[PDB]
Amino acid sequence: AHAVKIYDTCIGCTLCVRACPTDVIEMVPATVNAAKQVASTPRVEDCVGCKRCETACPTDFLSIRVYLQENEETQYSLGLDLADWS
Amino acid sequence: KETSASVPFLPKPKNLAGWVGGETEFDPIGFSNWFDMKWLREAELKHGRVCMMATVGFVLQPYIGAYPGVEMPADSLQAVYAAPSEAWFAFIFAAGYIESSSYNGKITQLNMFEDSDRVPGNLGWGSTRLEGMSKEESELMQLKELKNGRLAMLAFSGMVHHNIVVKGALFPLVPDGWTGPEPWAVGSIMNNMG
Amino acid sequence: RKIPAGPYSVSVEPLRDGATNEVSIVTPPISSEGVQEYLSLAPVFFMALAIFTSGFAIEVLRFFPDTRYW
Amino acid sequence: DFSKAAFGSATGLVAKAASQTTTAIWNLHADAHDFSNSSYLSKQVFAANLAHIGVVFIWLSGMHFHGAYFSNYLDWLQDPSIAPTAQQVSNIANQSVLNPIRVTSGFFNLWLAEGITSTYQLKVIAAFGLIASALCFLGSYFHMHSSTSFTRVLNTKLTSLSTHHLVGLLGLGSLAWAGHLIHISLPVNILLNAGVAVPSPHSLLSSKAVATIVEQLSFSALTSSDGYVWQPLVYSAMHHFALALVLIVGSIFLSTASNPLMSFTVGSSWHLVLGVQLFVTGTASVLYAQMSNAYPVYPYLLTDHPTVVSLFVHHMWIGGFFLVGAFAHLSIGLVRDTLPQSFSVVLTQRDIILGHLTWVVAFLGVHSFGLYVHNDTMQALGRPDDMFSDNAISLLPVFARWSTLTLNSTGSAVSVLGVELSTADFMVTHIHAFTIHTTVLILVKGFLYARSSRLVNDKYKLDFRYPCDGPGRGGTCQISPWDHVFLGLFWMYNSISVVIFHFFWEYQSNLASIKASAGGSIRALASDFELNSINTNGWLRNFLWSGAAQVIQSYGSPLAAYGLTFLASHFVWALSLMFLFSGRGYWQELIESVLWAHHKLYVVPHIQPRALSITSGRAVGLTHYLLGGIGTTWSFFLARIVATA
Amino acid sequence: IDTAPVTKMKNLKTGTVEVDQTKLSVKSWGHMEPCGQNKKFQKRIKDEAFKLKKRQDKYAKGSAAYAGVQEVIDQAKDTAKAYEGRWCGKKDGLPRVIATGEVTRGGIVTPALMFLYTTGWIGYAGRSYLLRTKDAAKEIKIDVPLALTCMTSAFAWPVYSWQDITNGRFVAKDTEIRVQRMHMA
């Protein structure tokens, strides 16, 4: 499961949420940005690692970071379509 | 509307208003609008002065002989080959010093006329003669200098290319049995049946 | 312009009444300032500089073949 | 106004800070001809086509100008055996060694087939080509700036377009060419072959010339009209007349009331038409490449071996490129259409078709290259009787050695074309089939997995040309239809390279065999190709290394230019390797360090230096790879076939 | 049965390394001689002239091709006469480039100075344009009068550049430019 993290620099764009093809990122209330909302990743197990969320983050560097973990691949992380491991 | 006095079928070029030779306002291409007029005037004056000295040298070189030893060739174009190396080095040193101390190092198109009161073409060589006189007379003298400079530029170009076509000295113009210049050598797009 | 025509069109509107004796110049409405601006483009200016440099080298090689004065 | 809009792309590039990067410049170049969907898309396409026609007319005019002024066309007319040169080379630097460049484009044979005997005619053709190019440029301008929208030509007026192309363009052009042949290309070749001087071509249109000097309509004329250089022109004239007749008759005897582009948008319709047109043009180029040496049609063409080789190889390359571009534009049209429901059966049999093609490619590759490697191993082990050859296990292409049929007043092409095939031909033909199948596999996979795939399920949202979807799902690089065309171009290069290698080795083998002498009539095998083109070592030794002597020993000879282009092609091909193997990020960091070095000296360029994008890097690498490989083959073939023939 | 040509070393056990001052010049080196009397170089020139004459003989007298090859022959003769002053080995005959630093025929100091001046001119012209056109618009759209002003004004690059270097207007302070400190230095 590719770990995905959210940092203080997030400004509540919701672009990372809209860019996720597997509904990993999620908008929680917070008191750190003017938008009063901050991205969170409660469904990292569905993260394929495509880094579309990083392509849509407007901050100077990625307020959302996807750390690929090749030693912990999952059928959800590998995007398996014809093989089931459950 | 306004048209140039010299070229009646072209617009009157700006930036030639207050200048010595600007009353004829001849600038068809219009480098006035593109470049600083101070630099253009300085370049014109320097070219004219260089070419006037060059014209009198070219004319008088086959006369006033040369340095004891070198043979000033009748055709002045070969004088560069006949010139001693020490003479060339002295000439280069003198030209460099004269042209580099004249502007205190601001000898470039971006920095020459950037200080303030750098009058175009006023290197201080006898400028006191113009310090007197009466405006119109001083401008008349400057116009005489400009017209002689242009004339000598064209004349020196003509002298060089006359020595090229004749392959000889300047003064024995059109030698006996001339029948026109020899056709130009070396190939071209029209030489290989273009 | 109800009839769909491309941008920068020298075409009169095709929705006209009986035959019109009108002047419709089919030549590009170019501008001298615009032409000078276009020839000052980085591709145009630098390709012209490269062509000038290459031709200068060509002429130097023609009139001074090889490095005879090394 | 228009001049202001000429640099409008650059003005838009500098208007926004986001487009003040070198990547913006590369995008401006990459998106140059990518005419976006708009009300004037068809105008833009048609005007671009007409402008390209003008460019080709400029090229034809230049070629005729070189024939008129910088060619020994008259000397070639007096003696066809001499080397056709049509490019003078001025004495600059030290290039004087290659001053006469033997042109292998076949223009001399073409002009002789056109009845051209004087360089004045070539001058006139060059002038009229310039005039035609000017007219095409005027028309392209007009259509882009003042004409009809042209949006109805592919859907509404497709019947009119197709009927006009069938009757007017094709049929009337063939009929006019038949008239030209019969009237000035046959008589001029008659009077040149007989050596009885050639009058003005218009004097042949007098109704008092050979048109009415004798009314006999068979092979019988003044003295003895037994010229066999002339008969191919007679056959060409008959073919053009028959083709014009059948086209005109069948056009009015055809339905043509079926436009499959009703369900496609105008942009996707244009892309699909371009794809099918590219497929047709590419297969036509390949067919012409085969038929050029299969059937003699130009005077003194087969005698000029470099011309034959160049025509074959060039048209094979063009056919391969256009066949790849066909699938490229099919993919573009499919992925850029809103509702491309027409390809429902193939997008629902996606995996079935792709997997069966995958098995076909795997089977063909293992079998063909295993025959080759098995022959290599057996020859290395000293087991020539265990190889796949005529003196061993024989893979005789039986399906090739039969064309017998009921005569019904026919001849010539009722057989295998009088050529016997052997094991080497079988194996190399299967190699060709496998390489073609692999190229088609990549292209068809790009087409099918263009809108969606099992890996990425929204690839239609990503358009046609994208670098990847990310390092997720294990890695999704090169999933785009553009990347599939990118790989299919490499495999087309491989396929066409093997095809032209087969043709060139067979051609040289036949030339050596017909150089038996006259008495030598047991060629046994000999046939260097047939005896050695069964091993990879056989190729590497007797074709590449053997024929490279001409191109590497060309220094100090007129083929030194071929040698230098050989070296430059190798250089460009290794530079391609540089671009293909590497990645964008590293170069970006290197550019960051270099840009720090610049900033340290107050240089600071504002068009921020960005390294080539992923797709841009792949495209540059592919361009250099194709250029290097094709140039190496070009230099090698031309040096080998000019020095030795 | 033999090995590669065995070379002979200096069994320099004297404890000193002697460098001959008189051997610090091209004219004093025993492996390169002037091209004028180099037999191999003369043979190369003769072979080149013979090949040019053979190429000329293909074309008939008075033709344009004959004149072209004749001009090539004249160029080769003049080039040979010029190269007679070069230095070309003793077994190759190919003129050599002396990169020691001695000002000799075929040396490197004068070409190095000419190239360095020309390219410092180029770089200073570009840098001056970028400094006086701090704008991406003027980068994509060349200001031709200003560009040519900078190009013709960069002739004084060697002295202006050093003045700026010594006066602090050439280099930029490391704390004022984008320097890589992502490791949180």
Ligand code: CLA
């Ligand atoms: C009838 C022929 C034809 C036409 C009209 C088009 C038209 C188009 N193609 Mg296309 N294509 C074709 C054939 C054709 N193609 C073939 C045969 C192939 C397979 C090789 C492709 C592969 C292809 C791809 C992969 C893509 C296109 C794209 C496009 C679109 C934009 C093109 C663009 O901006 O390029 C601008 C022009 C250039 C980039 C030209 C640059 C020069 C090229 C890259 C190399 C040339 C090297 C040269 C031959 C050697 C130099 C000489 C040497 C001596 C130095 C446009 C609709 C693009 C698109 O998005 O479509 C919507 C796209 O991604 N095409």
Ligand code: CLA
């Ligand atoms: C793939 C291509 C290929 C082919 C066709 C062959 C063929 C052959 N090799 Mg060979 N070889 C190859 C590649 C290939 N080689 C490569 C790449 C190498 C290098 C490692 C070698 C190295 C090699 C050696 C060292 C030797 C051979 C030998 C042989 C021969 C005997 C092999 C054998 O026992 O067959 C075994 C065959 C089978 C077990 C049957 C497999 C094929 C069946 C028929 C497929 C049927 C599919 C079926 C139709 C599916 C539909 C069913 C459905 C309808 C129900 C034979 C002519 C030997 C020899 O000298 O003989 C001349 C030998 O000593 N080979």
Ligand code: CLA
């Ligand atoms: C104003 C122009 C300019 C200037 C002053 C410099 C200056 C420098 N560059 Mg540089 N560079 C430039 C343009 C320029 N570059 C361009 C356009 C590119 C893209 C090709 C590069 C790519 C580049 C790389 C990859 C590297 C440098 C390096 C360097 C440094 C060492 C010198 C060197 O190796 O040059 C060599 C220059 C090149 C290899 C590319 C030159 C390309 C052209 C000739 C330069 C453009 C000149 C400009 C257009 C003039 C227009 C004037 C007009 C507008 C008035 C030096 C600080 C090196 C470095 O960091 O070392 C510390 C290094 O590794 N540069």
Ligand SMILES: CC1=C(C#C/C(C)=C/C=C/C(C)=C/C=C/C=C(C)/C=C/C=C(C)/C=C/[C@@]23O[C@]2(C)C[C@@H](O)CC3(C)C)C(C)(C)C[C@H](O)C1
């Ligand atoms: C400024 C100053 C001073 C000064 C000064 C100086 C040096 C002033 C000098 C003025 C000078 C030296 C002015 C030359 C003009 C030459 C001309 C016009 C050439 C005409 C040549 C012409 C018109 C054409 C000639 C032809 O050749 C052509 C073209 C073709 C030939 O076939 C035919 C002929 C030959 C006919 C002081 C007083 C010393 C100190 C003071 O403090 C500062």
Ligand SMILES: CC1=C(C/C=C(\C)CCC[C@H](C)CCC[C@H](C)CCCC(C)C)C(=O)c2ccccc2C1=O
């Ligand atoms: C080198 C390289 C770059 C760097 C390439 C850049 C920055 C392009 C700029 C190169 C300049 C424009 C070269 C200009 C042309 C050369 C000077 C050579 C042509 C002219 C000579 C023949 C005289 C990438 O951006 C890249 C991206 C993705 C995969 C691989 C690579 C890659 O390999």
Ligand code: SF4
């Ligand atoms: S795009 Fe980036 S800044 Fe915006 S909400 Fe998502 S993580 Fe935060």
Ligand code: SF4
């Ligand atoms: S990498 Fe892709 S799947 Fe994973 S969180 Fe980011 S957008 Fe979602």
Ligand code: SF4
């Ligand atoms: S390596 Fe490049 S192309 Fe492949 S997934 Fe990563 S970014 Fe995309």
